[PDB]
Design a protein around this ligand. Structure first.
Ligand SMILES: Nc1ncnc2c1ncn2[C@@H]1O[C@H](COP(=O)(O)OP(=O)(O)NP(=O)(O)O)[C@@H](O)[C@H]1O
Ligand SMILES: Nc1ncnc2c1ncn2[C@@H]1O[C@H](COP(=O)(O)OP(=O)(O)NP(=O)(O)O)[C@@H](O)[C@H]1O
Ligand SMILES: Nc1ncnc2c1ncn2[C@@H]1O[C@H](COP(=O)(O)OP(=O)(O)NP(=O)(O)O)[C@@H](O)[C@H]1O
Ligand SMILES: [Pt+2]
Ligand SMILES: [Pt+2]
Ligand SMILES: [Pt+2]
Ligand SMILES: [Pt+2]
Ligand SMILES: [Pt+2]
Ligand SMILES: [Pt+2]
Ligand SMILES: [Pt+2]
Ligand SMILES: [Pt+2]
Lengths: 803, 77, 78
């Protein structure tokens, strides 16, 4: 169509040079000046390998440029000298004398070589050219006259974008535009992207790359080229940096994660690094004086969802799968709520990619029913061989025959196997289509650049339509598949997610809605009684979601009052699990210990929360805390955020804050004995509270829950739920554990205590039941599968294995 | 380089057993587009190489899915 | 033992893909004769005058004790 990018850029370079030096006619000296950058420069190599010394050439050529008249405005870079144009057109005549379909930079050197007096003739020149590679001119991947330090140590993102290799960056207008801005500010034009790993810093850059290629970027960057550097070491580094400056700002360097070059405003750089990693660089002024931070914050779930939907196409094209939007939403939600490691953009994708990959092996793998029939056969098979042994021509013969007969099953082993290849066929087809549709997309976009509306026309209208229907046809053609599922769904996501955490039964199945509605049930499966507490907490949380409370607050804050060991911490624990799918979502602050430099020892808190946004935070004995803490705390209850030591605030909007204390306990108990009205108790108890807590505090509490003593029944109920784990842990040995009401009652008895509550129960159950049961197991009295019967005795429990 | 898939073909490799999960995981990773180069992290003696050579044997038996069905694993030296 | 290993190398040489019809297929029921010999034979070999063959716990526990201490416990002690 025209000249290879290489030579193409070379021309632009020369042109910009003409402008810089304020010249009127873009002459040969300009083209030389830019072509002869390093000893490494192709123009230099080829020329030196042919008998002339490039240095002298470059040397004398720049002399001419320096002896040129300085014009002005509309006269700068006004036109191309006859000589240059002549050579340029002569370069095409040479790209023909060579099968090369385009005019490469080397073929361009010849032309100029010809056009310039004093140096080697086409004879030695074509020679040297040839003597280098000896290939053709058609570059896309792994192809490019690589003798340049940038080409040799950097990936041209603007080029990958040009060819449409880079994936679709989506949803980052600000950041990009911001960078677009900073990349034009004289004082500080070198923007550094500061952000956490996985947030999508690089995307911003490559995103910007794509815009440049589309002209979506303003003026001054319209033709720019972004090169990503990927690191005697400094020897080559300098060879690179000094080569970018010779490009004259027409090439932006991007360092994933040098000073003097900037100390000349000639080295346009784009960075990317960690926060403190930038704060450390925020220690060397020569840098922070020319660098403009751009903190890329982790995308939100909605944004992440958009992004996934963006790449939706690409991914399912490579996996020849189908990623349902449902699954996308899961990948974003589930990761943002239960994957403490990586950060959103990334992890959500990894999940999907991980999902698809998984499922992709499944599709290309032998079905179930087949593998099933595969064994059933081998079963009857081994029977045959073993059935044709010892004579007995009456019982083993009819069988040996009707055995091969039943071995007819081998039909299904082929029938189904046919129904599978049949599906796989449809599938091999669809995968193809997707590939076309993809190729067709690069195809079109590539036209809406060259303006060749011709091609772009039939593609967007006609081509894309069919292909898009062809694939959507086959996809649908598999809406039913006894051996296939091209779909990637929640379960698939939830599974790979569960693989990194715990139980798909919940990760998947339960949706926040379903979960929040059964909340009171779930909680009661582990917390006996204390109904008032559950409701309050449950309602608060429900009232929280649904959006009826200030978004800048914790999901719910509570003050658990009442006796000891009767539910509080349990409920707190259970809540963490039921609401956040894990008891690991709990964070305790045993306040009764932080009685010293408390404040400082929590900005620890911020960190825990920092890594696990969705979590329950439990503050024990809140009254024992000092005014200092209440501030950090109060700050959590309001605006639901907190500024740590370093500075970067942590988000608490996704946390539940439970605070315990015994301040009203005595009075609460008293109110229950004298059996006076609940309201009378709450009010009486509140007054007390008003004496140890700042109203601002008591007022910002979502609820002031009051736990009460347990009833004999509840205690038994607790014994039961307490026994559950034992049953479970024993089940691993098929061992059953049936106890007498007498036995249970005993445990209930010894377990509960007026002042200590149900705290003892555990120790008791451990000593009275587990210790004995243990000895029996080790001794062998209790074997595998046995049904241990437990009943009361004179001073404890007794065991019995049935006969 | 030693061609493991070769040895696996001629039953030269030792019977690797009990590491289906790790193999399957390796298989999965190779199919990924973002990160398809799986690295086995483990202590010395645990059987990291076994996982690989284990995978080698599957390829030779067609026990591996499509896309790896004919592949050849070469252990650089 | 050498005649059995090579065979286990050939049974998989057929089920792998080709000529499953020829020999490799199900000599799986005739070979137990080997597993029948090596046993009724080793039994015969069980004796004295250095008919050493079986490698047992004691043997293991011993080399283990050699790197630690007392098979009396390492072993026995359950
Ligand atoms: N805005 C976006 N649109 C589409 N994909 C994105 C976007 N942002 C990030 N990604 C994807 O997320 C992964 C990492 O993106 P990247 O821009 O390199 O972020 P990072 O935080 O800088 N990580 P790193 O460069 O490894 O330190 C890649 O798979 C990207 O495709
Ligand atoms: N309502 C309940 N339902 C089930 N188990 C309970 C209940 N109340 C107390 N328990 C048991 O008692 C112990 C502690 O209960 P918990 O509600 O956390 O009390 P506590 O106030 O935190 N005790 P402590 O932190 O030791 O001062 C655990 O072994 C629980 O099983
Ligand atoms: N799954 C297995 N099946 C059979 N042999 C095994 C297995 N796993 C480990 N081994 C044995 O362990 C030794 C090393 O096996 P190899 O697969 O090379 O593991 P490694 O842990 O990677 N070694 P290294 O490279 O030194 O860290 C050999 O002697 C093997 O017999
Ligand atoms: Pt100049
Ligand atoms: Pt031209
Ligand atoms: Pt799989
Ligand atoms: Pt159907
Ligand atoms: Pt906990
Ligand atoms: Pt504290
Ligand atoms: Pt205290
Ligand atoms: Pt598989």
């Amino acid at each position: 169509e025209r000249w290879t990018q290489a030579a193409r850029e070379a021309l632009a370079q020369a042109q910009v040079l003409a402008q810089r030096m304020k010249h009127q006619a873009i002459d040969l000296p300009h083209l030389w000046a830019v072509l002869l950058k390093d000893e490494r420069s192709l123009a230099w190599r080829l020329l030196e390998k042919a008998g002339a010394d490039p240095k002298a050439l470059k040397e004398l050529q720049e002399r001419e440029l320096a002896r040129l008249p300085k014009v002005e405005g509309a006269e700068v870079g006004q036109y191309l000298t006859s000589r240059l144009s002549g050579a340029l057109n002569r370069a095409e005549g040479l790209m023909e004398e060579l099968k090369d379909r385009y005019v490469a930079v080397d073929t361009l050197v010849l032309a100029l070589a010809e056009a310039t007096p004093g140096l080697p003739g086409l004879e030695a020149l074509k020679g040297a050219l040839k003597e280098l590679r000896g290939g053709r001119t058609v570059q896309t991947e792994h192809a490019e006259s690589t003798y340049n330090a940038l080409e040799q140590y950097g990936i041209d993102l603007t080029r990958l974008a040009a060819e449409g290799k880079l994936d679709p960056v989506i949803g980052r207008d600000e950041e990009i535009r911001r960078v677009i801005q900073i990349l034009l500010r004289r004082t500080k034009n070198n923007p550094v992207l500061i952000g956490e790993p996985g947030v999508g810093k690089t995307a911003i850059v490559e995103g910007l790359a794509q815009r440049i290629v589309k002209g979506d970027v303003p003026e001054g960057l319209k033709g720019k080229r972004i090169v990503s550097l990927q690191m005697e070491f400094e020897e080559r580094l300098k060879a690179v940096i000094q080569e970018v400056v010779q490009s004259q700002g027409e090439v932006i360097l991007f360092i994933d994660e040098l000073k003097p070059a900037l100390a000349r405003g000639e080295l346009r750089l784009i960075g990317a690094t960690t926060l403190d990693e930038y704060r450390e660089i925020e220690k060397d002024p020569a840098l922070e004086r020319r660098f403009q931070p751009v903190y890329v914050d982790e995308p939100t779930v909605e944004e992440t969802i958009s992004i996934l939907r963006g790449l939706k196409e690409k991914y399912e094209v490579h996996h020849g799968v189908r990623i349902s939007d449902s699954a996308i939403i899961a990948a974003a939600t589930l990761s943002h709520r239960y994957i403490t490691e990586r950060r959103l953009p990334d992890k959500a994708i990894d999940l999907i990619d991980e999902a698809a990959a998984r499922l992709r092996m499944a599709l290309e793998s032998a079905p179930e029913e087949i593998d099933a029939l595969e064994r059933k056969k081998l079963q009857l098979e081994i029977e045959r061989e073993a059935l044709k042994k010892e004579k007995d021509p009456d019982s083993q013969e009819r069988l040996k025959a009707i055995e091969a007969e039943i071995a007819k099953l081998t039909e299904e082993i082929a029938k189904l196997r046919a129904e599978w290849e049949r599906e796989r066929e449809i599938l091999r087809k669809l995968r193809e289509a997707q590939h076309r549709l993809d190729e067709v997309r690069r195809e079109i976009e590539l036209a809406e650049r060259q303006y060749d509306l011709n091609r772009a026309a039939e593609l967007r209208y006609g081509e894309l339509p069919k292909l898009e229907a062809e694939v959507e046809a086959l996809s649908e053609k598999l809406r039913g598949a006894r051996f296939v599922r091209l779909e990637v769904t929640e379960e698939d996501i939830a599974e790979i997610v569960s693989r990194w955490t715990g139980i798909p039964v919940s990760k998947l199945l339960e949706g926040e809605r379903e979960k929040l509605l059964r909340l009171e049930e779930e909680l009661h499966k582990r917390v006996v009684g204390q109904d008032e507490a559950i409701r309050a907490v449950a309602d608060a949380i429900r009232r929280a979601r649904a959006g009826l409370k200030d978004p800048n607050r914790p999901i719910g804050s509570f003050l658990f009052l009442g006796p000891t060991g009767v539910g509080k911490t349990e409920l707190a624990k259970t809540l963490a699990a039921t609401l956040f799918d894990t008891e690991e979502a709990m964070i305790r602050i045993d306040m009764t210990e932080y009685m010293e430099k408390h404040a400082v020892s929590r900005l620890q808190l911020t960190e825990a929360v920092r890594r696990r946004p969705y979590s329950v935070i439990l503050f024990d004995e809140i009254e024992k805390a000092h005014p200092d803490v209440f501030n950090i705390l109060l700050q959590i209850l309001d605006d639901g955020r907190l500024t740590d030591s370093h500075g970067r605030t942590v988000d608490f909007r996704n946390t539940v804050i439970i605070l315990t204390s015994n301040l009203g306990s005595p009075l609460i108990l008293e109110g229950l004995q004298k059996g006076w009205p609940y309201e009378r108790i709450r009010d009486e108890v509140f007054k007390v509270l008003q004496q140890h807590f700042r109203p601002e505090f008591l007022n910002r509490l979502d609820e002031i829950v009051v736990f009460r003593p347990l009833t004999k029944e509840q205690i038994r109920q607790i014994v039961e739920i307490q026994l559950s784990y034992l049953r479970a842990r024993l089940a691993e040995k098929r061992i059953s554990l049936e106890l007498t009401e007498a036995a249970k009652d005993f445990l209930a008895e010894r377990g509960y205590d007026p002042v200590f509550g149900a705290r003892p129960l555990r120790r008791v159950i451990q000593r009275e039941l587990e210790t004995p049961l243990a000895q029996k197991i080790l001794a062998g009295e209790v074997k595998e599968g046995d049904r241990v019967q437990v009943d009361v005795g004179p001073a404890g429990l007794v065991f019995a294995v049935p006969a």
